[PDB]
Amino acid sequence: VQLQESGGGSVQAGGSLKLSCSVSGYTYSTYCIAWFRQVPGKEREGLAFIKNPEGNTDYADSVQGRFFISQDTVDNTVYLSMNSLKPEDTATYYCAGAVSNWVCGMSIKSQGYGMDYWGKGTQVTVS
Amino acid sequence: VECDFSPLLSGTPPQVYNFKRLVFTNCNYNLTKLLSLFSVNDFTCSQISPAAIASNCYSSLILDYFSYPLSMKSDLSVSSAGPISQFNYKQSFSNPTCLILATVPHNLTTITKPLKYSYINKCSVPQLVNANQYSPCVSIVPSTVWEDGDYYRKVASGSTVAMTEQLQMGFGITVQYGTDTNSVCPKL
Ligand SMILES: *[C@@H]1O[C@H](CO)[C@@H](O[C@@H]2O[C@H](CO)[C@@H](O[C@@H]3O[C@H](CO[C@H]4O[C@H](CO)[C@@H](O)[C@H](O)[C@@H]4O)[C@@H](O)[C@H](O[C@H]4O[C@H](CO)[C@@H](O)[C@H](O)[C@@H]4O)[C@@H]3O)[C@H](O)[C@H]2NC(C)=O)[C@H](O)[C@H]1NC(C)=O
């Protein structure tokens, strides 16, 4: 399994930015894909997660109704449309995969504890 | 599809006499992943092996879980010579089983501690729990014993053990093998 973020960069104060996470290597269809961030000197925060028996998602409460995890129908690449971006949103955004799907809401509440596969992250800076 | 172990990861696990029972049919499981989410301190089995129970197909898989302090491992080994198997929880002898003792690590932050560990020390002539059933006193004994020594009667006496830094739990698994129905399988 391989995961790579993209789409980040410089965003306007208040603007939106769509991040992606290309997904290869998954054989079965049941697994957890999450989204994370980490401003330096601090711990990884959990953001959004996807579950692949049905497509149910949830989002940590500090990005509720601002960040929107989507997944491509054919590409099985997961997206993260982020909105109302504040400087407090500046961080390195990581993408993370796990081996099953119920391990998800938990790692989203525990800075990625149960996640298995990780990306190198991309950089998002809001002015 | 895929067995739904999520409910274990959220909430306050009940005490041993109020064990929560999750039943799984027609689902593929991954037990090794579930156990990797914990610091596993003890893993014994009856009529099956740890390796076999994570890698076999069953007609149903039953997972019981509850708060249980690791210092009371002896109180399980004593079996029917002690309160736990006499009064709170006692696994089937007609089906293969495992019992696992685990500490929930600091990083798995969504398992909530109770005020203390509690168990029934007596529940009555004595009224013993039958294999795989609840104690007849489940109704009157409270979700948590208030003070070590309470005597509830409508006769059930409770005991307490102080809470540990990190919550310690117990997991009981019972599998049943059928004919033409073994569709709880490991995912590959
Ligand atoms: C059912 O569930 C089990 C339990 O997870 C799975 O077995 C494991 O699969 C995971 C996922 O690949 C393995 O995890 C990885 O761990 C590597 C370190 O290995 C040691 O530490 C692990 C605990 O994490 C021990 O289990 C193991 O014995 C070793 O001591 C990491 O280094 C890996 O990460 C790196 O690589 C990935 C890409 O591969 C990147 O994304 C990361 O950023 C990083 O570069 C990885 O996180 C785990 O080791 C496996 N355990 C065992 C015992 O084999 C089963 O696969 C699963 N079954 C199914 C069908 O899903």
Short mmCIF file of all heavy atoms in Angstrom, two decimals, chain A residues 27-28 30-31 51 53 98-103 106 109-111 113-116, chain B residues 1-6 9 30 33-34 36-38 105 107-110 187-188:
data_model
loop_
_atom_site.label_atom_id
_atom_site.label_comp_id
_atom_site.label_asym_id
_atom_site.label_seq_id
_atom_site.Cartn_x
_atom_site.Cartn_y
_atom_site.Cartn_z
N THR A 27 -6.07 -4.52 -1.52
CA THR A 27 -6.60 -5.71 -2.19
C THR A 27 -8.07 -5.94 -1.88
O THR A 27 -8.87 -6.19 -2.79
CB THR A 27 -5.78 -6.95 -1.78
OG1 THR A 27 -5.82 -7.10 -0.35
CG2 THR A 27 -4.32 -6.81 -2.23
N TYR A 28 -8.43 -5.92 -0.63
CA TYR A 28 -9.80 -6.11 -0.28
C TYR A 28 -10.38 -4.76 -0.43
O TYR A 28 -9.74 -3.90 -0.94
CB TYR A 28 -9.95 -6.52 1.18
CG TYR A 28 -8.91 -5.97 2.07
CD1 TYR A 28 -9.21 -4.99 2.97
CD2 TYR A 28 -7.65 -6.43 2.02
CE1 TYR A 28 -8.28 -4.49 3.80
CE2 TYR A 28 -6.69 -5.93 2.84
CZ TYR A 28 -7.03 -4.97 3.73
OH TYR A 28 -6.08 -4.48 4.53
N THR A 30 -12.21 -3.30 2.37
CA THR A 30 -12.59 -2.82 3.66
C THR A 30 -11.40 -2.23 4.31
O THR A 30 -10.46 -2.92 4.57
CB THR A 30 -13.00 -3.99 4.52
OG1 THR A 30 -12.22 -5.08 4.11
CG2 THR A 30 -14.43 -4.35 4.31
N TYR A 31 -11.42 -0.94 4.57
CA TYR A 31 -10.32 -0.29 5.27
C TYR A 31 -10.68 1.15 5.63
O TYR A 31 -11.67 1.72 5.16
CB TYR A 31 -9.01 -0.33 4.45
CG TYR A 31 -9.14 0.30 3.09
CD1 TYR A 31 -8.95 1.66 2.91
CD2 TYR A 31 -9.45 -0.48 1.99
CE1 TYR A 31 -9.09 2.23 1.67
CE2 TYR A 31 -9.59 0.08 0.73
CZ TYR A 31 -9.40 1.43 0.58
OH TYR A 31 -9.53 1.99 -0.67
N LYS A 51 -14.64 5.08 5.77
CA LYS A 51 -14.80 3.66 6.06
C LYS A 51 -15.36 2.96 4.83
O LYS A 51 -16.44 3.33 4.35
CB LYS A 51 -15.74 3.43 7.25
CG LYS A 51 -15.04 3.03 8.53
CD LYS A 51 -16.01 2.37 9.53
CE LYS A 51 -16.53 1.02 9.04
NZ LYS A 51 -16.82 0.09 10.15
N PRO A 53 -16.88 -0.13 3.95
CA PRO A 53 -17.92 -1.11 3.61
C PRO A 53 -19.13 -0.43 2.98
O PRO A 53 -19.96 -1.08 2.34
CB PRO A 53 -18.28 -1.73 4.96
CG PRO A 53 -18.14 -0.60 5.90
CD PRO A 53 -16.95 0.21 5.39
N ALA A 98 -5.37 2.22 7.20
CA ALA A 98 -5.31 1.12 8.16
C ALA A 98 -5.73 -0.17 7.48
O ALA A 98 -6.12 -0.20 6.31
CB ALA A 98 -6.17 1.39 9.40
N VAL A 99 -5.68 -1.26 8.25
CA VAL A 99 -5.88 -2.58 7.69
C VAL A 99 -7.34 -3.05 7.77
O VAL A 99 -7.73 -3.99 7.07
CB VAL A 99 -4.92 -3.54 8.42
CG1 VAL A 99 -5.66 -4.39 9.44
CG2 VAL A 99 -4.09 -4.36 7.43
N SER A 100 -8.16 -2.41 8.60
CA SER A 100 -9.58 -2.70 8.70
C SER A 100 -10.28 -1.36 8.78
O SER A 100 -9.63 -0.31 8.70
CB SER A 100 -9.90 -3.57 9.92
OG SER A 100 -9.21 -4.81 9.89
N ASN A 101 -11.59 -1.38 8.95
CA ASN A 101 -12.35 -0.14 8.81
C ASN A 101 -12.89 0.40 10.12
O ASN A 101 -13.05 1.62 10.25
CB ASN A 101 -13.49 -0.31 7.80
CG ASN A 101 -14.35 -1.52 8.10
OD1 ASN A 101 -14.34 -2.05 9.20
ND2 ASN A 101 -15.11 -1.96 7.10
N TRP A 102 -13.17 -0.46 11.09
CA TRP A 102 -13.64 -0.01 12.39
C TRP A 102 -12.57 0.77 13.16
O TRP A 102 -12.91 1.50 14.10
CB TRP A 102 -14.15 -1.23 13.18
CG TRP A 102 -13.21 -2.39 13.13
CD1 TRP A 102 -13.15 -3.35 12.16
CD2 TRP A 102 -12.19 -2.69 14.07
NE1 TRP A 102 -12.15 -4.24 12.45
CE2 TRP A 102 -11.54 -3.86 13.62
CE3 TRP A 102 -11.76 -2.10 15.26
CZ2 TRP A 102 -10.49 -4.44 14.31
CZ3 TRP A 102 -10.72 -2.68 15.94
CH2 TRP A 102 -10.09 -3.83 15.47
N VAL A 103 -11.29 0.61 12.80
CA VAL A 103 -10.20 1.38 13.39
C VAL A 103 -10.15 2.71 12.67
O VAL A 103 -9.46 2.84 11.66
CB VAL A 103 -8.83 0.67 13.26
CG1 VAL A 103 -7.70 1.56 13.80
CG2 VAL A 103 -8.83 -0.66 13.96
N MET A 106 -11.68 6.09 16.25
CA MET A 106 -10.79 6.09 17.40
C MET A 106 -9.48 6.82 17.11
O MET A 106 -9.07 7.69 17.89
CB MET A 106 -10.51 4.65 17.84
CG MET A 106 -9.45 4.55 18.89
SD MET A 106 -7.77 4.25 18.29
CE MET A 106 -8.06 2.86 17.21
N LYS A 109 -9.58 10.30 16.97
CA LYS A 109 -9.60 10.91 18.27
C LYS A 109 -8.41 10.66 19.08
O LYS A 109 -8.40 10.97 20.20
CB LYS A 109 -10.77 10.49 19.03
CG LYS A 109 -12.02 10.71 18.33
CD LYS A 109 -12.96 10.80 19.44
CE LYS A 109 -14.35 10.89 18.93
NZ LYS A 109 -15.33 10.91 20.04
N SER A 110 -7.37 10.15 18.49
CA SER A 110 -6.17 9.82 19.22
C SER A 110 -4.85 9.95 18.49
O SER A 110 -3.95 9.18 18.70
CB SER A 110 -6.34 8.40 19.67
OG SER A 110 -6.20 7.55 18.57
N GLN A 111 -4.77 10.97 17.62
CA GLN A 111 -3.64 11.29 16.76
C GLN A 111 -2.98 10.22 15.97
O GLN A 111 -1.79 10.13 15.89
CB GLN A 111 -2.61 12.15 17.45
CG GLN A 111 -2.29 11.74 18.81
CD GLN A 111 -3.17 12.41 19.77
OE1 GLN A 111 -4.34 12.60 19.53
NE2 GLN A 111 -2.62 12.77 20.87
N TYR A 113 -3.31 6.74 16.35
CA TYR A 113 -2.74 5.60 17.07
C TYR A 113 -2.85 4.30 16.28
O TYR A 113 -1.86 3.56 16.15
CB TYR A 113 -3.41 5.47 18.44
CG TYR A 113 -3.05 4.18 19.16
CD1 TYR A 113 -1.71 3.84 19.35
CD2 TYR A 113 -4.04 3.31 19.66
CE1 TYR A 113 -1.36 2.69 20.01
CE2 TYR A 113 -3.69 2.15 20.32
CZ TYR A 113 -2.34 1.84 20.50
OH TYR A 113 -1.94 0.69 21.14
N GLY A 114 -4.03 3.98 15.75
CA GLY A 114 -4.20 2.68 15.14
C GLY A 114 -3.94 2.59 13.65
O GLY A 114 -4.13 1.52 13.07
N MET A 115 -3.52 3.68 13.01
CA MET A 115 -3.33 3.71 11.56
C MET A 115 -2.06 2.96 11.16
O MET A 115 -1.04 3.01 11.86
CB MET A 115 -3.27 5.15 11.07
CG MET A 115 -4.49 5.99 11.44
SD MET A 115 -6.02 5.15 11.01
CE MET A 115 -5.90 5.08 9.22
N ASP A 116 -2.11 2.29 10.01
CA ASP A 116 -1.01 1.46 9.52
C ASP A 116 -0.16 2.14 8.44
O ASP A 116 1.07 2.19 8.58
CB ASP A 116 -1.57 0.13 9.00
CG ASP A 116 -2.14 -0.74 10.13
OD1 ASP A 116 -1.33 -1.43 10.79
OD2 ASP A 116 -3.37 -0.72 10.36
N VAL B 1 -20.44 -7.53 5.87
CA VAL B 1 -19.05 -7.89 5.64
C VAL B 1 -18.26 -7.20 6.77
O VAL B 1 -18.86 -6.40 7.48
CB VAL B 1 -18.58 -7.51 4.18
CG1 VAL B 1 -17.68 -6.27 4.15
CG2 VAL B 1 -17.93 -8.69 3.45
N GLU B 2 -16.96 -7.53 6.93
CA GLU B 2 -16.06 -7.17 8.04
C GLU B 2 -16.69 -7.02 9.42
O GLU B 2 -17.57 -6.16 9.63
CB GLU B 2 -15.27 -5.90 7.74
CG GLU B 2 -14.56 -5.33 9.00
CD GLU B 2 -13.02 -5.36 8.99
OE1 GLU B 2 -12.39 -5.23 7.91
OE2 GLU B 2 -12.43 -5.50 10.09
N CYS B 3 -16.20 -7.80 10.39
CA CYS B 3 -16.80 -7.85 11.71
C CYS B 3 -16.59 -6.52 12.44
O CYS B 3 -15.56 -5.86 12.31
CB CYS B 3 -16.24 -9.04 12.50
SG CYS B 3 -16.46 -10.67 11.64
N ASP B 4 -17.60 -6.13 13.22
CA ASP B 4 -17.75 -4.75 13.71
C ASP B 4 -17.25 -4.63 15.15
O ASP B 4 -18.02 -4.54 16.11
CB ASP B 4 -19.20 -4.33 13.54
CG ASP B 4 -20.15 -5.21 14.36
OD1 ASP B 4 -20.65 -6.23 13.81
OD2 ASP B 4 -20.49 -4.88 15.53
N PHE B 5 -15.93 -4.59 15.30
CA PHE B 5 -15.35 -4.45 16.63
C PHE B 5 -15.37 -3.02 17.20
O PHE B 5 -15.14 -2.84 18.40
CB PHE B 5 -13.92 -5.02 16.63
CG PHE B 5 -13.88 -6.51 16.42
CD1 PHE B 5 -12.81 -7.11 15.78
CD2 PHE B 5 -14.91 -7.31 16.88
CE1 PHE B 5 -12.75 -8.49 15.61
CE2 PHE B 5 -14.87 -8.69 16.70
CZ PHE B 5 -13.79 -9.27 16.07
N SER B 6 -15.71 -2.01 16.38
CA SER B 6 -15.82 -0.62 16.85
C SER B 6 -16.48 -0.43 18.22
O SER B 6 -15.96 0.38 19.00
CB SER B 6 -16.60 0.26 15.86
OG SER B 6 -15.79 0.73 14.79
N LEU B 9 -14.37 0.06 21.31
CA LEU B 9 -13.41 1.15 21.40
C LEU B 9 -14.00 2.43 21.97
O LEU B 9 -13.25 3.39 22.17
CB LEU B 9 -12.82 1.42 20.02
CG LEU B 9 -12.15 0.19 19.40
CD1 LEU B 9 -11.46 0.50 18.07
CD2 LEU B 9 -11.17 -0.42 20.39
N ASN B 30 -10.77 -9.58 11.87
CA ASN B 30 -9.31 -9.53 12.03
C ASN B 30 -9.06 -9.33 13.52
O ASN B 30 -9.08 -8.21 14.04
CB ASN B 30 -8.66 -8.43 11.21
CG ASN B 30 -7.15 -8.52 11.24
OD1 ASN B 30 -6.59 -9.29 12.06
ND2 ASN B 30 -6.46 -7.76 10.37
N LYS B 33 -5.53 -7.51 14.53
CA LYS B 33 -5.60 -6.06 14.51
C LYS B 33 -6.21 -5.53 15.81
O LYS B 33 -5.70 -4.56 16.40
CB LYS B 33 -6.42 -5.58 13.31
CG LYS B 33 -6.59 -4.09 13.26
CD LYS B 33 -5.26 -3.41 12.94
CE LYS B 33 -5.40 -1.89 12.98
NZ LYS B 33 -4.32 -1.28 13.80
N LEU B 34 -7.32 -6.14 16.24
CA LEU B 34 -8.00 -5.72 17.46
C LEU B 34 -7.05 -5.79 18.66
O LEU B 34 -6.94 -4.84 19.44
CB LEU B 34 -9.24 -6.59 17.69
CG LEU B 34 -10.08 -6.43 18.96
CD1 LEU B 34 -10.68 -5.07 18.94
CD2 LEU B 34 -11.17 -7.52 19.10
N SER B 36 -3.79 -5.84 18.57
CA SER B 36 -2.67 -4.91 18.44
C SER B 36 -3.03 -3.54 18.99
O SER B 36 -2.14 -2.80 19.43
CB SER B 36 -2.21 -4.81 16.97
OG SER B 36 -3.24 -4.28 16.14
N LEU B 37 -4.32 -3.19 18.98
CA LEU B 37 -4.79 -1.96 19.60
C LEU B 37 -4.70 -1.98 21.12
O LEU B 37 -5.20 -1.06 21.78
CB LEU B 37 -6.25 -1.69 19.23
CG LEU B 37 -6.69 -1.45 17.78
CD1 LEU B 37 -8.13 -0.96 17.77
CD2 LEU B 37 -5.76 -0.49 17.03
N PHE B 38 -4.10 -3.00 21.72
CA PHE B 38 -4.03 -3.10 23.16
C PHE B 38 -2.68 -3.66 23.58
O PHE B 38 -1.93 -4.24 22.78
CB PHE B 38 -5.13 -3.99 23.74
CG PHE B 38 -6.52 -3.50 23.49
CD1 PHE B 38 -7.19 -3.86 22.34
CD2 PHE B 38 -7.16 -2.69 24.40
CE1 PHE B 38 -8.48 -3.41 22.09
CE2 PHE B 38 -8.45 -2.24 24.17
CZ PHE B 38 -9.11 -2.61 23.01
N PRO B 105 -4.05 1.21 26.20
CA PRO B 105 -2.88 2.10 26.27
C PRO B 105 -3.31 3.55 26.31
O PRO B 105 -4.43 3.90 25.92
CB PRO B 105 -2.10 1.77 25.00
CG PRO B 105 -2.63 0.41 24.56
CD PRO B 105 -4.08 0.46 24.93
N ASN B 107 -2.56 5.86 24.45
CA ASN B 107 -2.83 6.40 23.12
C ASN B 107 -4.25 6.08 22.63
O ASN B 107 -4.81 6.86 21.85
CB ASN B 107 -1.78 5.89 22.14
CG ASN B 107 -0.54 6.79 22.08
OD1 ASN B 107 -0.37 7.69 22.92
ND2 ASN B 107 0.32 6.56 21.10
N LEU B 108 -4.85 4.97 23.07
CA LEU B 108 -6.23 4.64 22.69
C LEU B 108 -7.17 5.38 23.65
O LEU B 108 -7.74 4.82 24.58
CB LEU B 108 -6.45 3.13 22.73
CG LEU B 108 -7.54 2.46 21.88
CD1 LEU B 108 -7.47 0.96 22.10
CD2 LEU B 108 -8.95 2.96 22.20
N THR B 109 -7.35 6.67 23.37
CA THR B 109 -7.94 7.60 24.34
C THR B 109 -9.46 7.50 24.46
O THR B 109 -10.04 8.25 25.25
CB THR B 109 -7.57 9.05 23.97
OG1 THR B 109 -8.35 9.49 22.85
CG2 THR B 109 -6.10 9.15 23.62
N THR B 110 -10.14 6.64 23.72
CA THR B 110 -11.60 6.69 23.70
C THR B 110 -12.25 5.54 24.47
O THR B 110 -13.45 5.28 24.28
CB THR B 110 -12.11 6.71 22.27
OG1 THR B 110 -13.52 6.44 22.28
CG2 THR B 110 -11.39 5.66 21.46
N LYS B 187 -10.15 -12.31 7.39
CA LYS B 187 -9.93 -11.68 6.10
C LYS B 187 -8.49 -11.91 5.64
O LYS B 187 -7.56 -11.99 6.45
CB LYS B 187 -10.28 -10.20 6.11
CG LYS B 187 -9.84 -9.38 7.31
CD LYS B 187 -10.42 -7.96 7.22
CE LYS B 187 -9.59 -7.04 6.33
NZ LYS B 187 -8.32 -6.62 7.01
N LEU B 188 -8.33 -12.05 4.33
CA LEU B 188 -7.06 -12.42 3.74
C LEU B 188 -6.56 -11.37 2.74
O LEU B 188 -5.40 -11.38 2.33
CB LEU B 188 -7.20 -13.79 3.06
CG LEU B 188 -7.79 -14.91 3.93
CD1 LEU B 188 -8.76 -15.82 3.17
CD2 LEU B 188 -6.69 -15.74 4.58
#
